[PDB]
PDB file of C-alpha atoms (C1' of nucleotides) in Angstrom:
ATOM      1  CA  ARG K  24     -20.852  47.933  21.366  1.00 60.68           C
ATOM      2  CA  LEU K  25     -21.462  44.143  20.511  1.00 59.95           C
ATOM      3  CA  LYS K  26     -23.350  45.122  17.373  1.00 58.63           C
ATOM      4  CA  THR K  27     -20.730  47.876  16.470  1.00 59.81           C
ATOM      5  CA  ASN K  28     -17.646  45.671  17.176  1.00 59.15           C
ATOM      6  CA  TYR K  29     -19.284  43.413  14.403  1.00 58.70           C
ATOM      7  CA  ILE K  30     -18.416  45.749  11.612  1.00 60.26           C
ATOM      8  CA  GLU K  31     -15.039  47.013  12.651  1.00 65.08           C
ATOM      9  CA  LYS K  32     -13.103  43.976  13.870  1.00 65.36           C
ATOM     10  CA  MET K  33     -15.376  40.871  13.716  1.00 62.63           C
ATOM     11  CA  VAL K  34     -16.014  40.934   9.902  1.00 62.00           C
ATOM     12  CA  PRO K  35     -12.652  42.254   8.929  1.00 63.96           C
ATOM     13  CA  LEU K  36     -10.758  39.307  10.230  1.00 63.36           C
ATOM     14  CA  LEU K  37     -13.436  37.033   8.834  1.00 64.17           C
ATOM     15  CA  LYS K  38     -12.545  38.558   5.400  1.00 61.76           C
ATOM     16  CA  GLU K  39      -8.764  37.675   5.619  1.00 63.25           C
ATOM     17  CA  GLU K  40      -8.979  34.480   7.414  1.00 65.63           C
ATOM     18  CA  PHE K  41     -11.416  32.948   4.972  1.00 65.26           C
ATOM     19  CA  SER K  42     -11.869  33.455   1.206  1.00 64.84           C
ATOM     20  CA  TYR K  43     -11.463  37.159   0.013  1.00 65.99           C
ATOM     21  CA  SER K  44     -14.619  38.479  -1.475  1.00 61.28           C
ATOM     22  CA  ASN K  45     -17.276  41.052  -0.747  1.00 64.07           C
ATOM     23  CA  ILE K  46     -18.259  42.348   2.621  1.00 64.50           C
ATOM     24  CA  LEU K  47     -21.416  40.123   3.575  1.00 64.94           C
ATOM     25  CA  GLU K  48     -21.488  36.313   3.212  1.00 63.26           C
ATOM     26  CA  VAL K  49     -19.657  36.275   6.523  1.00 63.41           C
ATOM     27  CA  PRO K  50     -20.685  34.462   9.660  1.00 63.34           C
ATOM     28  CA  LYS K  51     -23.501  36.482  11.397  1.00 62.64           C
ATOM     29  CA  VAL K  52     -25.749  35.425  14.210  1.00 62.59           C
ATOM     30  CA  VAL K  53     -29.368  35.317  13.349  1.00 59.18           C
ATOM     31  CA  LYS K  54     -31.012  34.543  16.637  1.00 56.88           C
ATOM     32  CA  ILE K  55     -30.358  33.263  20.252  1.00 58.96           C
ATOM     33  CA  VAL K  56     -32.705  30.545  21.485  1.00 58.12           C
ATOM     34  CA  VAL K  57     -31.885  30.226  25.154  1.00 56.60           C
ATOM     35  CA  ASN K  58     -34.471  27.467  25.931  1.00 58.21           C
ATOM     36  CA  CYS K  59     -34.944  26.546  29.637  1.00 56.32           C
ATOM     37  CA  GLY K  60     -36.612  23.119  29.850  1.00 55.12           C
ATOM     38  CA  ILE K  61     -38.416  22.248  33.084  1.00 58.73           C
ATOM     39  CA  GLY K  62     -38.372  18.970  35.011  1.00 57.27           C
ATOM     40  CA  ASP K  63     -40.678  16.669  33.109  1.00 57.73           C
ATOM     41  CA  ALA K  64     -42.599  13.730  34.614  1.00 59.34           C
ATOM     42  CA  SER K  65     -43.758  15.880  37.654  1.00 59.45           C
ATOM     43  CA  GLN K  66     -47.196  17.317  36.631  1.00 56.53           C
ATOM     44  CA  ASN K  67     -46.989  20.794  38.404  1.00 58.48           C
ATOM     45  CA  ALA K  68     -48.242  24.154  37.030  1.00 57.31           C
ATOM     46  CA  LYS K  69     -45.916  25.934  39.354  1.00 58.95           C
ATOM     47  CA  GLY K  70     -42.731  24.973  37.581  1.00 60.27           C
ATOM     48  CA  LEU K  71     -44.339  26.034  34.357  1.00 57.72           C
ATOM     49  CA  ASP K  72     -45.210  29.520  35.518  1.00 54.22           C
ATOM     50  CA  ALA K  73     -41.882  29.750  37.362  1.00 55.48           C
ATOM     51  CA  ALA K  74     -40.215  29.256  33.971  1.00 57.34           C
ATOM     52  CA  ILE K  75     -42.232  31.665  31.856  1.00 54.46           C
ATOM     53  CA  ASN K  76     -41.685  34.265  34.441  1.00 53.79           C
ATOM     54  CA  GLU K  77     -37.992  33.455  34.730  1.00 53.54           C
ATOM     55  CA  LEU K  78     -36.461  33.981  31.078  1.00 55.62           C
ATOM     56  CA  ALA K  79     -38.930  36.848  30.642  1.00 54.72           C
ATOM     57  CA  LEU K  80     -36.498  38.929  32.712  1.00 54.38           C
ATOM     58  CA  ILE K  81     -33.068  38.009  31.266  1.00 54.70           C
ATOM     59  CA  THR K  82     -34.493  38.490  27.773  1.00 53.61           C
ATOM     60  CA  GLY K  83     -37.345  40.731  28.567  1.00 55.17           C
ATOM     61  CA  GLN K  84     -39.636  38.774  26.231  1.00 48.55           C
ATOM     62  CA  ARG K  85     -42.558  36.559  26.958  1.00 47.21           C
ATOM     63  CA  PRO K  86     -41.545  32.750  26.581  1.00 47.64           C
ATOM     64  CA  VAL K  87     -43.227  30.174  24.523  1.00 50.65           C
ATOM     65  CA  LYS K  88     -45.650  27.371  25.436  1.00 49.05           C
ATOM     66  CA  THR K  89     -44.345  24.362  23.621  1.00 52.80           C
ATOM     67  CA  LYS K  90     -46.456  21.188  23.689  1.00 55.72           C
ATOM     68  CA  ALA K  91     -45.351  17.533  24.027  1.00 57.23           C
ATOM     69  CA  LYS K  92     -45.060  16.067  20.606  1.00 53.30           C
ATOM     70  CA  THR K  93     -47.404  13.283  19.754  1.00 52.37           C
ATOM     71  CA  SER K  94     -45.457   9.967  20.432  1.00 50.89           C
ATOM     72  CA  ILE K  95     -45.479   6.747  22.335  1.00 51.98           C
ATOM     73  CA  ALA K  96     -42.805   6.624  24.998  1.00 51.30           C
ATOM     74  CA  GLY K  97     -42.220   4.430  28.047  1.00 52.97           C
ATOM     75  CA  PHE K  98     -43.393   6.950  30.745  1.00 50.54           C
ATOM     76  CA  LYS K  99     -46.937   7.823  31.273  1.00 54.18           C
ATOM     77  CA  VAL K 100     -46.598  11.192  29.536  1.00 54.74           C
ATOM     78  CA  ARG K 101     -49.642  12.453  27.561  1.00 53.38           C
ATOM     79  CA  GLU K 102     -49.870  14.909  24.645  1.00 53.50           C
ATOM     80  CA  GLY K 103     -50.923  18.509  25.241  1.00 54.78           C
ATOM     81  CA  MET K 104     -48.870  19.283  28.450  1.00 55.70           C
ATOM     82  CA  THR K 105     -46.379  22.220  28.449  1.00 54.44           C
ATOM     83  CA  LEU K 106     -43.085  21.320  29.788  1.00 56.83           C
ATOM     84  CA  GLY K 107     -40.435  23.837  28.340  1.00 57.69           C
ATOM     85  CA  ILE K 108     -39.947  27.394  26.904  1.00 57.84           C
ATOM     86  CA  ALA K 109     -37.572  28.760  24.285  1.00 60.38           C
ATOM     87  CA  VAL K 110     -37.218  32.433  23.734  1.00 62.01           C
ATOM     88  CA  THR K 111     -35.258  33.927  20.776  1.00 61.64           C
ATOM     89  CA  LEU K 112     -34.091  37.493  20.313  1.00 64.59           C
ATOM     90  CA  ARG K 113     -33.230  39.140  17.016  1.00 62.92           C
ATOM     91  CA  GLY K 114     -31.696  42.542  15.898  1.00 62.31           C
ATOM     92  CA  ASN K 115     -30.547  44.863  18.544  1.00 61.39           C
ATOM     93  CA  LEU K 116     -32.261  42.706  21.257  1.00 63.57           C
ATOM     94  CA  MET K 117     -30.060  39.959  20.120  1.00 66.02           C
ATOM     95  CA  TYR K 118     -26.527  41.656  20.009  1.00 64.58           C
ATOM     96  CA  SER K 119     -27.429  43.387  23.291  1.00 63.64           C
ATOM     97  CA  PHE K 120     -28.469  40.246  25.120  1.00 66.16           C
ATOM     98  CA  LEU K 121     -25.472  38.355  23.543  1.00 67.16           C
ATOM     99  CA  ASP K 122     -23.179  41.062  24.909  1.00 63.94           C
ATOM    100  CA  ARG K 123     -24.400  40.345  28.379  1.00 62.30           C
ATOM    101  CA  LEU K 124     -23.269  36.762  28.800  1.00 64.87           C
ATOM    102  CA  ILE K 125     -19.933  37.718  27.176  1.00 60.58           C
ATOM    103  CA  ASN K 126     -19.314  40.661  29.408  1.00 60.22           C
ATOM    104  CA  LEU K 127     -21.324  40.339  32.526  1.00 61.15           C
ATOM    105  CA  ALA K 128     -22.681  37.054  34.067  1.00 59.48           C
ATOM    106  CA  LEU K 129     -19.321  35.547  33.243  1.00 64.03           C
ATOM    107  CA  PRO K 130     -16.841  34.730  34.721  1.00 60.46           C
ATOM    108  CA  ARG K 131     -19.084  35.825  37.490  1.00 58.12           C
ATOM    109  CA  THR K 132     -20.024  32.204  38.101  1.00 60.03           C
ATOM    110  CA  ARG K 133     -17.801  30.831  40.772  1.00 60.67           C
ATOM    111  CA  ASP K 134     -15.192  28.234  39.492  1.00 62.44           C
ATOM    112  CA  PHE K 135     -15.764  28.887  35.823  1.00 63.67           C
ATOM    113  CA  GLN K 136     -13.176  26.913  33.719  1.00 61.86           C
ATOM    114  CA  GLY K 137     -14.140  27.842  30.116  1.00 62.30           C
ATOM    115  CA  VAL K 138     -12.821  24.852  28.352  1.00 62.77           C
ATOM    116  CA  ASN K 139     -15.492  23.680  25.930  1.00 65.83           C
ATOM    117  CA  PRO K 140     -15.427  20.055  24.479  1.00 66.49           C
ATOM    118  CA  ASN K 141     -16.155  19.235  20.919  1.00 70.59           C
ATOM    119  CA  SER K 142     -19.699  20.325  20.443  1.00 73.95           C
ATOM    120  CA  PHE K 143     -20.858  21.705  17.071  1.00 74.01           C
ATOM    121  CA  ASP K 144     -23.819  20.494  15.025  1.00 74.21           C
ATOM    122  CA  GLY K 145     -22.439  20.475  11.543  1.00 68.80           C
ATOM    123  CA  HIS K 146     -23.764  23.568   9.755  1.00 67.38           C
ATOM    124  CA  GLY K 147     -22.211  26.777  11.241  1.00 65.87           C
ATOM    125  CA  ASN K 148     -24.211  26.533  14.512  1.00 64.75           C
ATOM    126  CA  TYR K 149     -22.994  26.515  18.175  1.00 63.67           C
ATOM    127  CA  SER K 150     -24.912  25.696  21.448  1.00 64.14           C
ATOM    128  CA  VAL K 151     -23.853  25.733  25.073  1.00 64.49           C
ATOM    129  CA  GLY K 152     -25.247  24.781  28.458  1.00 63.36           C
ATOM    130  CA  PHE K 153     -25.395  26.159  31.933  1.00 62.73           C
ATOM    131  CA  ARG K 154     -25.598  24.057  35.242  1.00 64.13           C
ATOM    132  CA  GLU K 155     -28.018  24.624  38.050  1.00 62.02           C
ATOM    133  CA  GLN K 156     -25.737  27.251  39.283  1.00 63.68           C
ATOM    134  CA  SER K 157     -25.808  30.274  37.055  1.00 69.45           C
ATOM    135  CA  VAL K 158     -26.019  34.052  37.510  1.00 71.84           C
ATOM    136  CA  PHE K 159     -27.625  36.956  35.649  1.00 70.69           C
ATOM    137  CA  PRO K 160     -28.266  40.705  36.405  1.00 71.78           C
ATOM    138  CA  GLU K 161     -31.873  40.026  35.873  1.00 72.45           C
ATOM    139  CA  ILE K 162     -32.108  36.730  37.886  1.00 70.09           C
ATOM    140  CA  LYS K 163     -33.005  37.285  41.526  1.00 69.99           C
ATOM    141  CA  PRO K 164     -31.966  34.486  43.979  1.00 67.88           C
ATOM    142  CA  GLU K 165     -34.319  36.135  46.483  1.00 67.72           C
ATOM    143  CA  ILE K 166     -37.741  35.111  45.298  1.00 67.17           C
ATOM    144  CA  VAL K 167     -37.407  31.860  43.263  1.00 63.94           C
ATOM    145  CA  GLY K 168     -38.217  28.243  43.644  1.00 60.47           C
ATOM    146  CA  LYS K 169     -34.887  26.252  43.105  1.00 62.14           C
ATOM    147  CA  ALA K 170     -31.684  26.925  41.467  1.00 62.56           C
ATOM    148  CA  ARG K 171     -32.079  25.725  37.748  1.00 62.22           C
ATOM    149  CA  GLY K 172     -29.987  25.990  34.758  1.00 58.62           C
ATOM    150  CA  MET K 173     -30.846  26.563  30.893  1.00 58.29           C
ATOM    151  CA  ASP K 174     -29.678  25.947  27.474  1.00 57.55           C
ATOM    152  CA  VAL K 175     -28.449  28.448  24.939  1.00 58.41           C
ATOM    153  CA  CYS K 176     -28.485  27.549  21.326  1.00 57.62           C
ATOM    154  CA  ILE K 177     -26.879  30.355  19.136  1.00 58.24           C
ATOM    155  CA  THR K 178     -27.334  29.829  15.435  1.00 60.29           C
ATOM    156  CA  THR K 179     -25.584  31.951  12.777  1.00 60.65           C
ATOM    157  CA  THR K 180     -25.549  32.363   9.009  1.00 63.89           C
ATOM    158  CA  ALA K 181     -22.371  30.322   8.773  1.00 65.48           C
ATOM    159  CA  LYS K 182     -22.188  27.584   6.022  1.00 67.48           C
ATOM    160  CA  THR K 183     -19.552  25.283   7.868  1.00 65.88           C
ATOM    161  CA  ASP K 184     -18.596  24.684  11.491  1.00 65.87           C
ATOM    162  CA  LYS K 185     -15.185  26.203  11.010  1.00 65.92           C
ATOM    163  CA  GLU K 186     -16.992  29.470  10.369  1.00 66.57           C
ATOM    164  CA  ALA K 187     -18.851  29.213  13.624  1.00 65.22           C
ATOM    165  CA  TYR K 188     -16.277  29.356  16.362  1.00 64.69           C
ATOM    166  CA  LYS K 189     -14.380  31.927  14.321  1.00 63.14           C
ATOM    167  CA  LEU K 190     -17.424  34.229  14.790  1.00 66.39           C
ATOM    168  CA  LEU K 191     -17.829  33.750  18.613  1.00 66.56           C
ATOM    169  CA  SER K 192     -14.036  33.573  19.516  1.00 68.64           C
ATOM    170  CA  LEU K 193     -13.171  37.028  18.205  1.00 65.98           C
ATOM    171  CA  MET K 194     -16.441  38.169  19.365  1.00 65.64           C
ATOM    172  CA  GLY K 195     -15.895  37.606  23.061  1.00 64.46           C
ATOM    173  CA  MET K 196     -17.477  34.327  23.844  1.00 65.80           C
ATOM    174  CA  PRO K 197     -15.404  32.307  26.446  1.00 65.79           C
ATOM    175  CA  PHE K 198     -13.163  29.686  24.729  1.00 64.30           C
TER     176      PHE K 198
ATOM    177  C1'   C X   1    -117.838  -7.780  42.114  1.00 62.63           C
ATOM    178  C1'   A X   2    -112.531  -8.557  43.212  1.00 62.11           C
ATOM    179  C1'   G X   3    -107.153  -9.772  45.193  1.00 60.08           C
ATOM    180  C1'   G X   4    -103.998 -14.627  45.778  1.00 61.64           C
ATOM    181  C1'   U X   5    -103.761 -19.890  44.891  1.00 61.00           C
ATOM    182  C1'   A X   6    -105.123 -22.599  40.921  1.00 65.76           C
ATOM    183  C1'   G X   7    -101.736 -27.530  33.730  1.00 66.29           C
ATOM    184  C1'   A X   8    -106.150 -31.171  38.811  1.00 65.81           C
ATOM    185  C1'   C X   9    -108.768 -29.592  33.579  1.00 64.77           C
ATOM    186  C1'   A X  10    -108.830 -27.213  28.615  1.00 64.74           C
ATOM    187  C1'   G X  11    -106.631 -24.428  24.180  1.00 63.95           C
ATOM    188  C1'   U X  12    -101.600 -23.905  21.753  1.00 67.20           C
ATOM    189  C1'   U X  13     -96.428 -22.359  21.011  1.00 71.71           C
ATOM    190  C1'   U X  14     -91.915 -24.110  21.571  1.00 72.49           C
ATOM    191  C1'   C X  15     -88.100 -21.089  14.294  1.00 71.36           C
ATOM    192  C1'   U X  16     -84.691 -21.738  10.492  1.00 71.76           C
ATOM    193  C1'   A X  17     -80.151 -22.047   8.367  1.00 71.64           C
ATOM    194  C1'   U X  18     -77.270 -26.962   8.564  1.00 70.53           C
ATOM    195  C1'   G X  19     -73.237 -31.283   1.801  1.00 72.66           C
ATOM    196  C1'   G X  20     -78.832 -36.489   7.824  1.00 69.51           C
ATOM    197  C1'   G X  21     -80.561 -34.576  12.010  1.00 69.81           C
ATOM    198  C1'   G X  22     -78.596 -32.876  16.604  1.00 69.88           C
ATOM    199  C1'   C X  23     -74.743 -29.981  19.819  1.00 72.83           C
ATOM    200  C1'   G X  24     -71.838 -25.821  18.647  1.00 70.91           C
ATOM    201  C1'   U X  25     -71.944 -21.994  15.303  1.00 72.00           C
ATOM    202  C1'   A X  26     -74.318 -19.070  12.082  1.00 75.34           C
ATOM    203  C1'   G X  27     -78.922 -16.230  10.648  1.00 75.88           C
ATOM    204  C1'   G X  28     -78.784  -6.821   9.196  1.00 75.40           C
ATOM    205  C1'   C X  29     -75.429  -2.838   7.955  1.00 73.55           C
ATOM    206  C1'   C X  30     -69.969  -1.347   6.958  1.00 75.01           C
ATOM    207  C1'   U X  31     -63.815  -2.661   4.566  1.00 75.74           C
ATOM    208  C1'   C X  32     -60.520  -5.947   1.285  1.00 78.93           C
ATOM    209  C1'   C X  33     -60.015 -10.677  -1.355  1.00 78.37           C
ATOM    210  C1'   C X  34     -62.363 -14.902  -3.887  1.00 78.30           C
ATOM    211  C1'   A X  35     -66.172 -12.052  -8.855  1.00 79.04           C
ATOM    212  C1'   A X  36     -61.913 -14.930 -14.184  1.00 79.20           C
ATOM    213  C1'   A X  37     -59.174  -5.845 -15.594  1.00 79.88           C
ATOM    214  C1'   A X  38     -67.184  -2.466 -17.204  1.00 81.37           C
ATOM    215  C1'   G X  39     -71.309  -3.756 -12.780  1.00 78.93           C
ATOM    216  C1'   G X  40     -73.722  -7.676 -10.998  1.00 78.42           C
ATOM    217  C1'   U X  41     -72.678 -12.883  -9.093  1.00 75.39           C
ATOM    218  C1'   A X  42     -72.348 -18.740  -4.225  1.00 69.19           C
ATOM    219  C1'   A X  43     -70.473 -21.745  -0.035  1.00 72.22           C
ATOM    220  C1'   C X  44     -70.749 -21.958   9.014  1.00 73.21           C
ATOM    221  C1'   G X  45     -64.601 -20.040   2.307  1.00 74.60           C
ATOM    222  C1'   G X  46     -59.787 -16.242   4.047  1.00 75.69           C
ATOM    223  C1'   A X  47     -58.200 -11.537   7.856  1.00 74.45           C
ATOM    224  C1'   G X  48     -61.205  -7.141  11.114  1.00 75.88           C
ATOM    225  C1'   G X  49     -65.423  -3.663  12.755  1.00 73.83           C
ATOM    226  C1'   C X  50     -70.754  -0.930  14.067  1.00 74.84           C
ATOM    227  C1'   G X  51     -76.104  -0.358  16.902  1.00 77.10           C
ATOM    228  C1'   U X  52     -71.902   5.562  18.140  1.00 73.08           C
ATOM    229  C1'   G X  53     -69.007   9.772  19.098  1.00 74.92           C
ATOM    230  C1'   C X  54     -69.292  15.390  18.690  1.00 74.20           C
ATOM    231  C1'   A X  55     -72.080  23.561  21.346  1.00 72.90           C
ATOM    232  C1'   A X  56     -68.221  21.094  18.386  1.00 71.04           C
ATOM    233  C1'   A X  57     -63.062  17.112  15.454  1.00 71.50           C
ATOM    234  C1'   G X  58     -69.947  21.812  12.061  1.00 70.77           C
ATOM    235  C1'   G X  59     -69.312  26.008   8.040  1.00 74.56           C
ATOM    236  C1'   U X  60     -66.470  29.879   6.619  1.00 75.38           C
ATOM    237  C1'   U X  61     -61.809  33.366   6.350  1.00 74.71           C
ATOM    238  C1'   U X  62     -56.541  33.469   7.022  1.00 76.64           C
ATOM    239  C1'   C X  63     -52.373  31.079   8.365  1.00 72.07           C
ATOM    240  C1'   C X  64     -49.615  26.877   9.583  1.00 70.87           C
ATOM    241  C1'   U X  65     -47.881  21.924   6.942  1.00 68.94           C
ATOM    242  C1'   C X  66     -45.144  16.237   9.258  1.00 64.99           C
ATOM    243  C1'   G X  67     -42.576  10.522  10.646  1.00 66.79           C
ATOM    244  C1'   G X  68     -37.933   9.016  11.645  1.00 69.13           C
ATOM    245  C1'   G X  69     -32.749   9.641  12.016  1.00 70.86           C
ATOM    246  C1'   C X  70     -27.753  12.232  12.378  1.00 67.62           C
ATOM    247  C1'   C X  71     -24.555  16.031  14.554  1.00 65.48           C
ATOM    248  C1'   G X  72     -24.659  19.360  19.444  1.00 65.46           C
ATOM    249  C1'   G X  73     -26.643  21.386  24.634  1.00 64.78           C
ATOM    250  C1'   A X  74     -27.793  22.012  32.541  1.00 62.22           C
ATOM    251  C1'   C X  75     -31.124  18.566  34.627  1.00 60.09           C
ATOM    252  C1'   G X  76     -29.533  13.928  28.687  1.00 60.90           C
ATOM    253  C1'   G X  77     -26.817   7.649  30.005  1.00 60.49           C
ATOM    254  C1'   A X  78     -32.429   3.902  24.095  1.00 61.13           C
ATOM    255  C1'   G X  79     -36.869   8.077  23.490  1.00 61.46           C
ATOM    256  C1'   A X  80     -38.566  13.912  26.601  1.00 64.31           C
ATOM    257  C1'   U X  81     -38.149  20.612  25.851  1.00 64.32           C
TER     258        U X  81
END
RNA sequence: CAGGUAGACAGUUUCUAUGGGGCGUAGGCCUCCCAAAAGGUAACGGAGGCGUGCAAAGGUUUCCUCGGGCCGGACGGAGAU
């Protein structure tokens, strides 16, 4: 449905709105990294496992084990400790997962405005964020530590920014 | 025979480097400069280190390759994923 809608409404409008040419070379999502950072500073392995076994449900894919980059900060943080995870889906697993947030999960969240600020990175890429009060068909508020949010960075093959929101707007993403 | 005490007595040591000696400091090895474009080459002449660490930071095969900054994102208000 999400993937099918792409080549039957999404791409079409992307051919008339922008420069007229072939079929491809149009804004197309390549991956969706819904990273979910964990409360740093506090040295606890519980929060780490509570994260890896958290996103592995909504995406059904084993998270990552990023390591603190070697640097000299103010805190007493060392290099070699895991403090975050970022899963990215591709192909069908991407369009399918992306269709979820669009259809379900939202506006399931109580009091969901939808008005997004400026944002944008500067190269056909868009990213969003969810507060510590979200909801997903996979998430179970029955056996979890504490309500925590996560980040969702969706990158596309768009060249410019004006070709980023034009792909998510006609797609179904709240705007 | 043997354990203490035993310079009262006897035999000696108690360094050198150092533009006096002495005090201090300096008296191997490893990096740069003074050595004036092959090396070698002085002076307590100018700035820093070592007397180890490591079943592996050993070898090999494959693969992966930064720092920092800008524009964005829940927990960001200078840096953290």
